[PDB]
Amino acid sequence: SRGSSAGFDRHITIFSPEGRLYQVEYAFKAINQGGLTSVAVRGKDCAVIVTQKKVPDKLLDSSTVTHLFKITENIGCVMTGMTADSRSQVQRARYEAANWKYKYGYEIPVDMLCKRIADISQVYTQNAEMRPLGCCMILIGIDEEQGPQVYKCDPAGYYCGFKATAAGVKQTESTSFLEKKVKKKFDWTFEQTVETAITCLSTVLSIDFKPSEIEVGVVTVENPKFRILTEAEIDAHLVALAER
Amino acid sequence: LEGRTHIFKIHARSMSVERDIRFELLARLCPNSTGAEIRSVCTEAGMFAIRARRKIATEKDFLEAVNKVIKSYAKFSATPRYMTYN
Amino acid sequence: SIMSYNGGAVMAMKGKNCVAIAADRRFGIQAQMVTTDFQKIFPMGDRLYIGLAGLATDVQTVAQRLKFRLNLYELKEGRQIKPYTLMSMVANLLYEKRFGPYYTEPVIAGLDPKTFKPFICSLDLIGCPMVTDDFVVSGTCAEQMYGMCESLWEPNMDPDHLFETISQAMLNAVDRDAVSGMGVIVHIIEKDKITTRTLKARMD
Amino acid sequence: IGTGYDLSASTFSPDGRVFQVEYAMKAVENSSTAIGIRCKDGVVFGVEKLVLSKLYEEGSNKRLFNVDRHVGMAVAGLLADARSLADIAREEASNFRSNFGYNIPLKHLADRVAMYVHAYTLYSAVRPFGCSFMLGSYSVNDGAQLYMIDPSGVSYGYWGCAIGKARQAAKTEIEKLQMKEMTCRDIVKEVAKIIYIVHDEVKDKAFELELSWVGELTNGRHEIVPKDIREEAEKYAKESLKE
Amino acid sequence: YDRGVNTFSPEGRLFQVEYAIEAIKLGSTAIGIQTSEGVCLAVEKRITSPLMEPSSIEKIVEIDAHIGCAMSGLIADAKTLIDKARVETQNHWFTYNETMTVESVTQAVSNLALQFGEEDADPGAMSRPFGVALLFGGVDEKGPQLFHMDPSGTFVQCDARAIGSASEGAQSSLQEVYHKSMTLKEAIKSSLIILKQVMEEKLNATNIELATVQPGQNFHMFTKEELEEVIKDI
Amino acid sequence: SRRYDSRTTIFSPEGRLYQVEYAMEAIGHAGTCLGILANDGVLLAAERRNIHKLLDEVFFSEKIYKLNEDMACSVAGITSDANVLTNELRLIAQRYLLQYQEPIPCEQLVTALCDIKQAYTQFGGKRPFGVSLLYIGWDKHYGFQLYQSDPSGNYGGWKATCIGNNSAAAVSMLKQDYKEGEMTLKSALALAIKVLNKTMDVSKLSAEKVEIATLTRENGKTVIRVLKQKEVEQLIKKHEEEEAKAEREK
Amino acid sequence: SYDRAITVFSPDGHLFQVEYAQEAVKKGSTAVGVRGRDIVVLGVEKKSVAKLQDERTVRKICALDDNVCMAFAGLTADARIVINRARVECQSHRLTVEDPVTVEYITRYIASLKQRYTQSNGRRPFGISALIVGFDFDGTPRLYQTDPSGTYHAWKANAIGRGAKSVREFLEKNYTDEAIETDDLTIKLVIKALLEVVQSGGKNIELAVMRRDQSLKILNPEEIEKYVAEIEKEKEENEKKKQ
Amino acid sequence: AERGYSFSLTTFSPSGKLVQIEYALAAVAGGAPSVGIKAANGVVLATEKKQKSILYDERSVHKVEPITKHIGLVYSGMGPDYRVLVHRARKLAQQYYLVYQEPIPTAQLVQRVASVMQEYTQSGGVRPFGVSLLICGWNEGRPYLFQSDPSGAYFAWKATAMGKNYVNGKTFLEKRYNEDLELEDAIHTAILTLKESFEGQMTEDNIEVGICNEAGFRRLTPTEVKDYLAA
Amino acid sequence: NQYDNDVTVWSPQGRIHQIEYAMEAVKQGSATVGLKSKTHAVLVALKRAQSELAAHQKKILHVDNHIGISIAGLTADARLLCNFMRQECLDSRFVFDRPLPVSRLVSLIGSKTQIPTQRYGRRPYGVGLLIAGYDDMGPHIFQTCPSANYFDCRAMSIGARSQSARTYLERHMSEFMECNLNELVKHGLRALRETLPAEQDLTTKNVSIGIVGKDLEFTIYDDDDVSPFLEGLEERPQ
């Protein structure tokens, strides 16, 4: 064992002799190929998403490069990994939400959306004909009673709720940072959250962003409609960090 | 077709065979067997021809050999698996 | 009517720790009788009988598919069926043909195989269940049977009085129905035994 | 890495790559160059259509397609695949019209077709498309738009873009234009110019230039550049090539 | 190494089709001769034992009254094609009230050629080609015709052809002796002669089967006596 | 797809089906199960592999499935596949009952299941059912019967036989001890306890290790009963008290 | 469903699965049949005398109709399937046509079925061979044989299974018009042929006979013992009183 | 475009083993441990719900799931597969209830679930589930504790353990546990046998517990688990 | 060798080998040449025979009154596509009562032949076509490959030893647009000639001619109907 292989256990989604699924692990490796990093932090009265906006060339409509997607008017998501797979998964999520509202007559909760998407990817994990998606979705939204919510789903079928999370290249480091800064117990206001997320990404990459190098999604209890901050308001948050 | 006949004639050309029997018939019953197997026949009859007590072999002696070697030793052959270079 | 094509009558009645189910015995096609020993009451376990009136084809076919499902049930699980459960199972079976229904209105009578507590019920042709603490009826002489059972039935009856009651009710109800009768058969079931009797009835 | 990990699109490599998609992309790379560039009043397409024989007619193997009356398409790569994708795009646009009543928005057509392309990079039962394509459109309610789609299913919006052999070189030539302020009229010459620059007369033989309008000058209809403007731009190019 | 049944070789060919052609080489040899007086078909039966009733060997069958068929290779695979041919002729008569032309029947049977393949097909569609060669011999408005078919699905008209294990020899022998003015007698005689040349076991009345189709006479399978009368004139 | 197909329904060059053979090997490593026919009944007796101190015992048995009012079966091999096959057996028997309103003859039930297993060997590309069965039953045509089926869908009738681990030993012992036409339920029970005692790896033999079922005919009804542990201990004690008796003679 | 070609051609032009099927047949219990005048006799060799085994449940001679019986060699389960299908078809022939069933017809059906399984996706050839035996209306007695390939022929006498070559040689040398001149003589010929491959017994020979419009008759081992006894007697009254 | 692989991925080895099933079982015996005890008047399931950090919200996903009002589930092995099986088990339970208007017996739900698991060892193009399930139930007065493994086979237990170190847990149960135990004592010994492996300060959010008495199945609140973890 | 057997497998160098190998099946077929004037479209095909006692394979097929085809490759696939094209033409006449434009028919063939180059266990059509037609946009000669690509040609040749013909045609393109029918058929016959050794030459037995034009429905000339074209040709000793 400890790295043993037999038959096709490294080509298709079947069990290795030590009970691994190697193709799924490879999908996780495929997430990092995008070379991006995304941070998601849950506040007392809000939820914030922030992600690098790598526009390598001025020949690109920088407005069409976005990893933030509106799944519902009140549910936002950020995708990390293979781009086209991410869009596929976004379409599926949209469909599942719309369908949920149509059948059940209330707005879908992020919890159940994430669970549904996860459930779908597990099938890819269990059927041999197709390969998992090399993407990772983080959902944010305000639920009616549980407050603000941040969830996350994997290429294998795993999903979970978080106080704070990150995905991509600098995942482990961002989790270290955030798990350091969550224990300190501070009044998680909106600006506290936004600043926390931005600084997490910034320190993790050692960059100090321009307002055109990142993108910030948000959702608040006072305003549950998923809002994508303009470059202006982003900068407004940036200059406020070089004060303390 | 014309090849094996040369292979048969070449191989058997050097032994006491029945001059009536025409290797052509045998060659016909040999679609795709290498020139080696064709050799197990020419010598195969040897056993048969010796198994009774005879100097010269007959048509059937070859026929049997053909059916004795080729066919019987068909499962093995490996000439059809090695054709596609496996 | 379709239900009057073969005619027939089935009744079930509660007692103390006992229960009773009776039926006429005629198999007739409209006015004409073909046989006088037709089975309308089918055992679905020890101490659980189902009573089927209506169109004789669907009597037989519903009985048969019910025995199908029931056998499977009693094999998968290691127990005889509970009466409630049988009722729901019949209901399901009937509603499966909601748009081309079996023309039978079943009556169930039986004792809870764990307890001994009597159960009786009846269902629609599409399987609407209906449980009572007194009696249930089905068939071409439903009005008659209702009239007799409302006037004869007392609550806590012992097996002999249950017998006398259901017998008189069936007889007098059936003898005022043209297409029911040719004999009456009565199964009174208790914890310890099952009594089956055939009454002396008119044959006209 | 080629150890069975590169025979199907249903198979990840142990570093987390799908090599069939990469090889499809490589099929695109080996193709002649086509560029497209968006200005303030529409989108212009240019294709370096290599002539493989003098026996082929002028205008054979067009690599500019009318996907909808407001959307043009420019392809590069395995041409069969490109045609099939043109048919798919057409039908997506058609269905959109019939079901929702208006001409399909380019961003949405791009999303749809690109999801269709991405659908072929998941299973072993089919192969990824060996073509990359550009979609251009102009509307008064949306503006001028230009998207590109690669074999992986990725769809991006561009101001200027190129596909095929001389992708980079073409991009470098394009970044020297100020197209966010130029008109379509003007851009055609610069497209023809960039094509003539990028073309390698040594490796590739003779060639034919394809050019496409779509903009306020055409009332939103994607059209071919008239022989007049085309020859004008070609002349400008040849003369600009001597420097 | 496993490949599909629908794979091309670099030399540009389907390995299943080629292999099937190889499978024909093993079959009993057959000769067909086209002639302005009719078409003749012979085949050697290849009885493996005196115990085997040779009348239960039919490598020559009637597709219809004016079209006969001689088969070589895997006979079991031939039966399916022959049935489909019969049904096809009859459908054409049903529909148009006139017999099928030999070329039309031939074409029809040839359409079941490359109808094999794995996924993307019916659950009762063919897994491999037919390992059989056919000779259709008929008479129609164009007169006496003879066609030959192989598992490639290519069918071609032939004046005189041989199929089977002794294909090459018999074909050469046929070329040496054929002219477009032979009589049916000379054709049958020639056929029996070449057949005797190539046959392993001695030619006799219960060892080959022989059939003619002439413009004025429906498909005729030669009886034992009728065969004897011809073999007599060796 | 051509690559990952293990090709299960295919001949081996010697003329055999590998997955069927291998399945038989799987069967060889299962709990011993044997069946003896008699003139006044028929019985199944099986080794219990579910023998651990924490097992709760919630079913009437472990290896004896009741399929029909007249008929019952025991199994050997992969237990889940046995659940599949037993479900299907039930269905078959109840279908026959629905069609003919009389119990299915045992041979038809066995054939009906065997055709399913065979089907699995011939097409579909699935693995075959790694299960052998013994069937005991009674019918109005051939009376008491014992049958046996293998994963090839091939079946046969016996007067006594065994299946599972150390099957061949048990078969030989039965060839010695059987008594054609002269068999009774009592004698057969003795034989069962004997062969079970010799074939089971763990000697001494507790009732916690064996499972006995009899099928007998009582007053027009068919009775199938699994022996309570007490009766089984009586049988075992009887075996030892007979064995210590024939050892005195020397 | 499973749509994969199991039986395909080998580069030398053989169907290998069919050959392995035929091997499976070659591992079968020996079965022979001879055809008489008013009797047709089929006998099958090793009954696998386990003595604890109910012979009735392992018979390898079944009846297809009142007119036709059949023996086999190969994979018993496959045989069971083929036999049942043939039975169904024997009856459906009587439905669709008031006339009964001829041995050639049912032979043709079975043959076609096997061939079908040699040329359908997913399926695997039935590994059996059959001796089909019967009396057609008009009274002519007939014996045909089939094969895992789908080929079929009529025989006067034949053998299949383990050591079929030996029995076949014997039958070649011993089938005369003198032998099988009486029922008692044809049965004798079959027992003589079967004793030349069997394990030397008599309890290991089953013999079944069909005769005229009468039904199938399977022989009890008493009668079989009697016939093998007259055999051993004639093998010591014409072979002992000479050599 | 897409179909489905039609051939089995789980096939007999020459030794007669279904190798994929044993490797799936290897995946089970690598998951967090879970212990189940049937105790006269009730059933206890407990499992190690240990996260990776402080960022995961443990009040969001659960491992002890209800199937109906009287049957509960825990698992060892792969998470997603468990999710699938739980959905499917709830569906089966509700089919049974539609038809019999009586809550499904625990044995029958175990049978049905097991059948589902067996399908994915014989249907085409798939792997078996990498999950062992412990299913607790109250029906007919008595309590019920079953286990189903990836082969689709199921067993009734008085008590058992699965996941990592399931052997030592099992022995500990064989010794330090017996009948006539009240549910409370059973919860006690369950948390006890879970502690024989929990590498950590077993908190009230590090483990999840469910009970099943003749008042219905329910998950113990974190508060109740804290109270029980206070000895 | 692992990228050779399936059409769904891209090679690490950006190519699909089953498609290529399929393309090689076109070169195995006897040569055929197709050229157009401004009014006529002409196919000339070298027919080929198995043995001397067998007829020559037919190589020009009639599709519709305005469209004929010349085939090169697997004949079964040829007939498959031919039936499809005839069906499409009949569908067009049925629904629209106008002949189907050649370019659209060709597009349909592209669509049809592209499909099996993308699905597993399917194989590309092993046949190349030259399509001669006349519609409202004049004469047309099209070429179709097993790769499902197609080309609008001014003249073309495909098959074995067709490069010679391609060269010749490439030399006399400038003449064709003004040629008369007899001269056009001649040029096609010469192109077809340059595809033979000096030992063998054209005959009324191994040549087939097909013409369609503004005043002429598609017509095939096979035997003695070919002789007036051949008997009008100056031989060539080089």
Side-chain angles (χ1 to χ4, degrees), chain B residues 5-72:
Chain B
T5 55
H6 236 64
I7 305 156
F8 252 13
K9 279 165 173 192
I10 300 159
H11 259 158
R13 165 209 88 238
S14 184
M15 84 189 230
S16 297
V17 306
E18 179 184 7
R19 290 303 172 191
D20 287 348
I21 74 160
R22 55 277 209 235
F23 289 97
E24 199 136 354
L25 203 284
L26 287 324
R28 229 179 99 233
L29 323 191
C30 347
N32 337 101
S33 43
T34 72
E37 297 219 328
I38 306 181
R39 187 280 281 162
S40 53
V41 194
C42 266
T43 62
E44 191 43 34
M47 280 276 139
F48 285 98
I50 287 172
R51 214 112 89 185
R53 278 99 244 216
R54 300 215 238 297
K55 65 144 187 298
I56 36 107
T58 68
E59 183 69 10
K60 300 157 148 185
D61 298 339
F62 283 107
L63 300 176
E64 291 177 16
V66 168
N67 292 332
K68 227 257 140 177
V69 172
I70 304 168
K71 251 94 159 154
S72 245

Side-chain angles (χ1 to χ4, degrees), chain A residues 13-17 19 21 42 115 118-119 122 125-129 151 157 159-164 175 179 182, chain H residues 4-5 9 20 23-24 26-27 51 53 55-57 60-61 78 80-81 83-84 120 125-130:
Chain A
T13 55
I14 60 171
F15 279 136
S16 72
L21 292 192
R42 178 182 80 192
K115 187 176 185 204
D119 279 336
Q122 185 279 336
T125 271
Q126 171 158 32
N127 291 74
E129 317 89 34
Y151 275 76
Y159 87 101
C160 205
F162 296 96
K163 302 166 201 221
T175 53
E179 75 182 336
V182 167
Chain H
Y5 290 166
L9 294 184
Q20 273 289 322
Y23 295 170
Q51 252 50 85
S53 294
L55 298 180
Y56 290 54
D57 199 312
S60 58
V61 194
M78 279 195 182
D81 292 29
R83 192 149 30 89
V84 172
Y120 283 74
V126 290
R127 60 173 182 80
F129 295 93

Side-chain angles (χ1 to χ4, degrees), chain C residues 73 76-77 79 82 85 88-89, chain H residues 96 99-102 105 108 111:
Chain C
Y73 181 91
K76 285 198 196 176
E77 329 195 337
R79 61 178 187 186
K82 315 164 53 67
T85 298
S88 299
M89 176 181 289
Chain H
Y96 191 96
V99 178
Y100 303 104
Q101 286 284 287
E102 175 194 41
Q108 299 303 319
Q111 288 183 41

